[PDB]
Design a protein around this ligand. Structure first.
Ligand SMILES: CC(=O)O[C@H]1C(=O)[C@@]2(C)[C@H]([C@H](OC(=O)c3ccccc3)[C@]3(O)C[C@H](OC(=O)[C@H](O)[C@@H](NC(=O)c4ccccc4)c4ccccc4)C(C)=C1C3(C)C)[C@]1(OC(C)=O)CO[C@@H]1C[C@@H]2O
Ligand SMILES: Nc1nc2c(ncn2[C@@H]2O[C@H](COP(=O)(O)OP(=O)(O)OP(=O)(O)O)[C@@H](O)[C@H]2O)c(=O)[nH]1
Ligand SMILES: Nc1nc2c(ncn2[C@@H]2O[C@H](COP(=O)(O)OP(=O)(O)OP(=O)(O)O)[C@@H](O)[C@H]2O)c(=O)[nH]1
Ligand SMILES: Nc1nc2c(ncn2[C@@H]2O[C@H](COP(=O)(O)OP(=O)(O)O)[C@@H](O)[C@H]2O)c(=O)[nH]1
Ligand SMILES: Nc1nc2c(ncn2[C@@H]2O[C@H](COP(=O)(O)OP(=O)(O)O)[C@@H](O)[C@H]2O)c(=O)[nH]1
Ligand SMILES: [Mg+2]
Ligand SMILES: [Mg+2]
Lengths: 432, 118, 431, 432, 431
């Protein structure tokens, strides 16, 4: 009765969504046909015959990555009106995905979203899976969050961004894109979750002992986080937390709405033995400066608000045991104007492991969503990568030639300059 | 007879940070002043974690005097203003990471905070 | 389906392309007839980027072959993979350019250009969504420099929103093959810095040493040099028509690689390059393929990358591998060579990984350079242009064909304007 | 409830620990796999599925001897996170185990120790096994005992040194490594036990009639000492001594904390017959100058505080018998200011023989630990093996070239000549 | 995994190494192809100390072979165990050193040193953690004394904290093979005592007698002398690549051995050395293997150990044995020979025990001497330098290559500085 739909912009969103929708079809027994041998009406609008089809829109400008889905294992599952393609990709260009190419098929997207809200009596929220690097994921998304805020306004709009790494970069104009796509999503989103690649490569090597992972084996980890925020809308928990509740407990100022996810336990199949994994143990796995999936140091900044999302056979006395030890510790510094810094969620489901996978089978798990000050250092980086390229006017002429002002960048950096000063505004402690 | 790192720093500037023939006039601007200081230990100040050379120091153990010889930057740094510790692998000819944080004779290069450049 | 149109101008371009379509057709299972004989359907999901389907299951190359003497056309038509072309495409005059620029761009070029463009106009109408035009010509001959850049200036009037990547062949420093190739190359850079988005510069001097040392060959025929260039030529579009983890087309390789609209002369590179017997003494790993690439002894442009500095770098890998290794090795060869890369473009290594190797290997790297290392390539030609201009030898073969003396002063001032801008960003640093 | 962990620095500690952790698994019935077909919680933290794992940290600097354990019989038992290696060993060089190599991975050790104290509510003490010879055993231990006394301070710390023999030597700079490591460990260790190699060859040849033993057969004897010092934690007896009770009953002054060990009975299988092995007999087996495990003459010095640790089937009336006869005897001279020189534990467990062993099966045993003045000659020996190899400045340039003062050696011996005089200071008897 | 690079030079070093890689390949079960065919995994747990894995299961030796005439390199390439190498390693000139120190260090060495180090740099990149460099050369030849000492001075500028052990072959007292080899030995000791951590010293005069007396052979070919030398060369690093009770490496045998940074010239020794039929008359025990070692009739350096005294002694044993005997026998041959060991180093016998015998034996001992007994070996050559310099014969073949007359006055003053220190510690006593 509370339904939530999911959009997939760009190459990054579709390949994440392949790992997502494969995982839900294992939690519920759903075949690739949509058959099954019922609280899952939140994602699966059924048919008069036995078939469940997802509430997903796979939008892209190049038809390349979509043809895997139209020919792969989950061809039969999706609805062939959803899979909107185009002709030319935005091609690492914000000014093509927002002014030129994305303007063409923005109407076919919003018409298809219109036909998915009408099957929903109690429409809950939006999920956008998009990167910051490429042109489609950062330029077509910034158009799309603009349109749904005018169309709806009241509904909760969650993103799951892919934050560009401080050390690994697979693009050259990538700091031009992330400044422009933050100017737009700042006022028309609700809670953008930050995920980095470089921090997952550390987690895939140290905690998992896999030397050679793939985008496949990274996307199995981002699927588990997405399947942990929305596992409270899909099962019968002792303490359920809604997507309308994450917007309140984590956003103290309308500018600052950038948490960073963390999952635990992340262990191999052979190290699944040799340790006991109680909730007094797996809680301390989360607050490490080495298990966060964003390359930042949480000992530099301060946690404004945590949000622990337990699941499995977890008992809420031991949660009180686990949490009370934490804010007695010295290195973890909660913010002084905020005496309460948690939000607990217990669900009655163990995490389900995909066959041919890498994560071990555990009976209890935790996602951790937390809004720390420490991402201000990660925003200090993209202003320094911006000013080393704009001062020499590098790569400007590919953006001017698709409808852009040459002074629009310096206006958009001034947004990021105000956003940089807001974290330091909060991280101080006004006494008396 | 004591321990030094002057043949390592001379090896490191000439092969990893200023190796190309573009920086060959700039390499001679710094290398000729290194032969005159009587410091046993030296250490290299980069800018980012991408290890681009911008400054060179000299280090005095038991006093932690980190006076500046060449480059651009502060005259003296402390243990408060440090981020990472590098070591010049003569094997690989690549600066690796030391997971420790104590500035000793095995440490060959470091990075400072972003606050000291704004 | 993002269709590409392949023009072949000059003698050299007709001989690279006669091997290039032999190179492509083994990636799709195509006989000399034109019919399909491959195995996997992934050959045929994007077969329509280069081919038009004919009746009965055949396919013809979307290829246009331009010459002035009819000698090389018969060699293509008599040889294998010659009947696969369309007999309507073989446009040629009856005079021959005579190794002359003013004859092939002004005198004889202005009489066969309309018969070319009407087929170029025809081949664009069969396409769904036109991606862009690739051209294959010299910079030293009369045809490929005179008839070639005539076709660029007409097309960029006709198709302004289309990428245009000429895969030029640059003259060599020590050995030459034309007395007046400094004259025929300074007149063509005037057209190529203003009308083509990117231009992959390739030498012959550095291309023999790759055949001599790395391949370990004794007698390298042009059918073994162009055999090597055509590997790079498919590897640029190897992810425009095959699935991958991370993708690249002809447009992503134009935005990330071109920092300024004039500085767009690139330089290739390829790996692995074994021997006949020394293939079994090296490991076939992604860190091994990377260190072969960044040598100065593998760049097909005859200039040292250690002279000058890099501005941007592409690396279009193929085959199946792991994305962690690539993202670490591209980090690895940036830290130890941070003097070679420029500072005001941070993390400047564009990366692209296909899922399909070349037919027979396991993995391979195509490499694109963009450097200030070609500042002496133009400085060398602009000196041989200048010393042969003071005595003004060999001029009456140009002036008598309808050219004024001021045009030589214009293009020389154009090229010293280009060398001055490579020198500008090589020394400009931020604070 | 009284948990005790064990670090094994160096090559000497690991192969002793191979003899040790083989022995505890034979006592408690623990398989090599970790299964078993309730008081043993001190060394074996269990798991939800029953598979007990030891509390061990096997730190080394070369990966050589560690890989034997990772491929041996006890591969499945240990936790594979624990086994910490390096690349280049210190290689008989104190200046490489404390300033160059062991500094690089000292954080990997302490962080894994940090993840072992947190499972322990009743943390009892430490068991650092090392030698004095090599650079890893003497330079990394001198680093590690520095860090744990800063970290913990209050906890009890026990060493099991392999003291360098007076006449057998398998190294060249072996008196350099001890004087550097004793200067460091003197103010951080708390009760270090001395075991020689040479005096065990005397026992293995004479009392056991094995002419050709091995380090294997020299480490089965040191396994029996360590099993019997901690035989009162793991079991239930008539009189149980604790690890905190040793550091009170054996340490008369904060400098003098070097007790040597002695086990009895040590007889073969053929001589297991032909005699009776009473408690009135095995006590007299300990106080012989020929049954010690340190090559010193105990009749040349005075016992300051003995400590007998009986076990098996011992009746405490006979302990009143066997002790009261001894300090009436003439040659065994105690110290005149100490009228009371014993501390007795009686346990209800016989010593267990390892299959494929050399010792006999006995029904009673004793691990005497004795603090005496007679080790002052063993410290007067290395100072004579120091000044000869320092007057010529021999082997100095391998130490100076790794961050060392060349004037530090004159200071380190100066903090040995004071310890040389303290045993002579205590050994005299102030009248009136 | 502590990898070791095996550089070779000269005619002597190649023929030693061509038997040495025959020697190692039996301890790891490597065929002439390069594919594994052994029995136990202990051959493959530390196979990477001397090898790089190739594609398909093959292995290649980490070996770099340097010459100046191509005669010996063709000889190794034609024989068996010659195709296993990397063909990119065989660096050779075209001139030949001409049995000349100046021509192999100034004239021809300075033109072909760059093609060596660029492959030395490549083999260092394949290593995870580089242990050090072992080099095999002469001290009397032209190449191995001039080109060998160039690859040490160029490497110690590059890898200053790595162990550099040469296994030189010292000229013999009575028999010779070169008229000017007293001039070549004085020019290398200037280069070896400042840049190599240790140097094993081998004569041929001491090496024929062991083939005659102890082995009981009548026709010792070099393939039976180098067969004996390569048992020692494998015996030092066999504790670095096999499990043991008490372990040693290339570093523990450098701190326990060299008391002063100049005095690092070692004299090896091996046992057992049976005959063909006299193997069944001696007992194969640890007390028997020791008394064969400490004779003067088994030392491979032609000098009397009984003249002068030992400073340090390493005894790297092999095979399975009992640790009581070894700790007693080394005590036994220190007390009865207490006038042969020095006083101010007490208990100076470094023990090392491996767990693996040589393939076919039961136990074996590799001995590493360090003595004042090699003070007359330098006193002999400095006397053969002195007579030939007073007449200054054979000088114009060196002066004509850019060498000054002062340079011979330097090294002979340097070698008398070496002799003066061995005499300084032979009589230095403590009180
Ligand atoms: C049994 C087997 O596996 O044989 C291989 C082979 O032995 C090796 C040695 C090949 C071989 O290449 C050459 O010897 C060579 C000759 C002249 C110039 C350049 C190369 C091969 O001839 C070449 C050939 O390449 C292809 O099939 C690719 O698809 C390649 N095709 C052509 O170049 C081509 C040749 C003739 C006719 C038509 C096309 C290609 C590469 C990039 C882009 C498109 C196509 C391969 C794998 C082999 C042989 C047959 C021996 C190597 O080359 C290539 C380009 O793959 C040389 O080093 C590689 C490693 C290969 O393993
Ligand atoms: N985690 C993850 N990141 C991915 C994946 N695919 C791409 N990315 C990241 O996405 C960024 C590149 O953006 P893309 O999505 O490929 O580009 P695009 O949205 O298609 O835009 P254009 O191609 O320019 O039109 C880089 O940071 C990639 O690392 C994936 O499967 N998983
Ligand atoms: N009792 C006993 N002593 C041993 C054993 N192994 C080594 N030793 C002794 O330990 C001393 C040598 O120290 P090692 O532990 O091997 O050296 P290390 O700690 O590894 O240090 P480095 O190798 O220098 O880095 C000598 O006195 C050996 O007799 C063993 O199994 N049992
Ligand atoms: N790589 C390559 N270069 C060629 C080939 N044929 C000719 N060239 C080069 O092309 C130049 C001569 O130009 P050419 O194309 O024949 O003259 P045109 O016909 O008037 O354009 C010289 O530099 C030749 O080396 C070929 O097959 N391959
Ligand atoms: N042990 C040994 N010595 C050799 C061998 N070949 C040459 N020598 C010695 O090497 C010396 C000659 O030097 P050589 O290496 O041939 O000259 P180079 O090639 O100029 O370095 C003489 O003392 C020879 O006895 C060999 O195979 N084994
Ligand atoms: Mg895209
Ligand atoms: Mg060791």
């Amino acid at each position: 009765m509370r339904e939530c739909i999911s959009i997939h912009v760009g190459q990054a969103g579709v390949q994440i969504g392949n790992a997502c929708w494969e995982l839900y079809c294992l939690e519920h027994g759903i075949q690739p046909d949509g058959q099954m041998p019922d609280s899952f009406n939140t994602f699966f609008s059924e048919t008069g015959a036995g078939k469940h089809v997802p509430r997903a829109v796979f939008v892209d400008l190049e038809p390349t990555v979509i043809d895997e889905v139209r020919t792969g294992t989950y061809r039969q599952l999706f609805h062939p009106e959803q899979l909107i393609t185009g002709k030319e990709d935005a091609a690492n260009n914000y000014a093509r995905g927002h002014y030129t190419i994305g303007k063409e098929i923005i109407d076919l997207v919003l018409d298809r979203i219109r036909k998915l809200a009408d099957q929903c009596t109690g429409l809950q929220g939006f999920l956008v899976f998009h990167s910051f690097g490429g042109g489609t994921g950062s330029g077509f998304t910034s158009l799309l969050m603009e349109r749904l805020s005018v169309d709806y306004g009241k509904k909760s709009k969650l993103e799951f961004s892919i934050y560009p790494a401080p050390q690994v970069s697979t693009a050259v104009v990538e700091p031009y894109n992330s400044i422009l796509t933050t100017h737009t999503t700042l006022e028309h989103s609700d809670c953008a979750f930050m995920v980095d690649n470089e921090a997952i490569y550390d987690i895939c090597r140290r905690n998992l002992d896999i030397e050679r992972p793939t985008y496949t084996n990274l996307n199995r980890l981002i699927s588990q986080i997405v399947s942990s925020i929305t596992a409270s809308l899909r099962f019968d928990g002792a303490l359920n937390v809604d997507l309308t509740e994450f917007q309140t407990n984590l956003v103290p100022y309308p500018r600052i709405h950038f948490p960073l996810a963390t999952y635990a336990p992340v262990i191999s199949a052979e190290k699944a033995y040799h340790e006991q994994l109680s909730v007094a143990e797996i809680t301390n796995a989360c607050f490490e400066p080495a298990n966060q999936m964003v390359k930042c140091d949480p000992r530099h900044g301060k946690y404004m608000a945590c949000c622990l999302l337990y699941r499995g056979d977890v008992v809420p006395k031991d949660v009180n045991a686990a949490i009370a030890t934490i804010k007695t510790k010295r290195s973890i510094q909660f913010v002084d104007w905020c005496p309460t810094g948690f939000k607990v969620g217990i669900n009655y489901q163990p995490p389900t492991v995909v066959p041919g996978g890498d994560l071990a089978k555990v009976q209890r798990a935790v996602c951790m969503l937390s809004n720390t000050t420490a991402i201000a250092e990660a925003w200090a980086r993209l202003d320094h990568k911006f000013d080393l390229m704009y001062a020499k006017r590098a790569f400007v002429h590919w953006y001017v030639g698709e409808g852009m002002e040459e002074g629009e960048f310096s206006e958009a950096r001034e947004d990021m300059a105000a956003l940089e000063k807001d974290y330091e505004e909060v991280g101080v402690d006004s006494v008396e | 007879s004591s321990k030094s790192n002057k043949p390592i720093i001379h090896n490191a500037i000439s092969h990893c940070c200023l190796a190309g023939k573009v920086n060959e006039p700039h390499k001679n601007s710094i290398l000729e002043e290194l032969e005159k200081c009587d410091a046993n230990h030296y250490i290299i100040l980069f800018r980012d974690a991408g290890c681009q050379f911008r400054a060179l120091y000299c280090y005095y153990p038991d006093t932690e005097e980190i006076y500046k010889l060449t480059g651009t930057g502060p005259k003296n740094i402390t243990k408060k203003m440090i981020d990472k510790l590098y070591k010049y692998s003569s094997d690989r000819k690549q600066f690796n990471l030391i997971p420790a944080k104590t500035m000793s004779v095995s440490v060959d290069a470091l990075t400072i905070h972003n606050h000291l450049w704004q | 389906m993002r269709e590409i149109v392949h023009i072949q101008a000059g003698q050299c371009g007709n001989q690279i392309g006669a091997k290039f379509w032999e190179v492509i057709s083994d990636e799709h299972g195509i006989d000399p007839t034109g019919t399909y004989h491959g195995d996997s359907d992934l050959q045929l999901d994007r077969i329509s980027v280069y081919y038009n389907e004919a009746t009965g299951g055949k396919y013809v190359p979307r290829a246009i072959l331009v010459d002035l003497e009819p000698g090389t056309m018969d060699s293509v038509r008599s040889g294998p993979f010659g009947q696969i072309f369309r007999p309507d495409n073989f446009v040629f005059g009856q005079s021959g350019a005579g190794n002359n620029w003013a004859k092939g761009h002004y005198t004889e070029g202005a009489e066969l250009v309309d018969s070319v463009l009407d087929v170029v106009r025809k081949e664009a109408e069969s396409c769904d969504c036109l991606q862009g035009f690739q051209l294959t010509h010299s910079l030293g001959g009369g045809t490929g420099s005179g008839m070639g850049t005539l076709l660029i200036s007409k097309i960029r009037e006709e198709y302004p929103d289309r990428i245009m990547n000429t895969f030029s062949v640059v003259p060599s420093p020590k050995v030459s093959d034309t007395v007046v190739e400094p004259y025929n190359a300074t007149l063509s850079v005037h057209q190529l810095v203003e009308n083509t988005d990117e231009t992959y510069c390739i030498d012959n001097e550095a291309l023999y040493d790759i055949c001599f040392r790395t391949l370990k060959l004794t007698t390298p025929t042009y059918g073994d040099l162009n055999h090597l260039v055509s590997a790079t030529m498919s590897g640029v579009t190897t992810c425009l028509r095959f699935p991958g983890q991370l993708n690249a087309d002809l447009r992503k390789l134009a935005v990330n690689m071109v920092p300024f609209p004039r500085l767009h002369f690139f330089m290739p590179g390829f790996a692995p390059l074994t021997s006949r017997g020394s293939q079994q003494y090296r490991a076939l790993t992604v860190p091994e393929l990377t260190q072969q690439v960044f040598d100065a002894k593998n760049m097909m442009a005859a200039c040292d990358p250690r002279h000058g500095r890099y501005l941007t770098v592409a690396a279009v890998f193929r085959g199946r591998m792991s994305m962690k290794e690539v993202d670490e090795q591209m980090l690895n060869v940036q830290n130890k060579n941070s003097s070679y890369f420029v500072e005001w473009i941070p993390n400047n290594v564009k990366t692209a990984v296909c899922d399909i190797p070349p037919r027979g290997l396991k993995m391979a790297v195509t490499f694109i350079g963009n450097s200030t290392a070609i500042q002496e390539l133009f400085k060398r030609i602009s000196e041989q242009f200048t010393a042969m201009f003071r005595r003004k030898a060999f001029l009456h073969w140009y002036t008598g064909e309808g050219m004024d003396e001021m045009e030589f002063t214009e293009a020389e001032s154009n090229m010293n304007d280009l060398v001055s801008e490579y020198q500008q960003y090589q020394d400009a640093t931020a604070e």
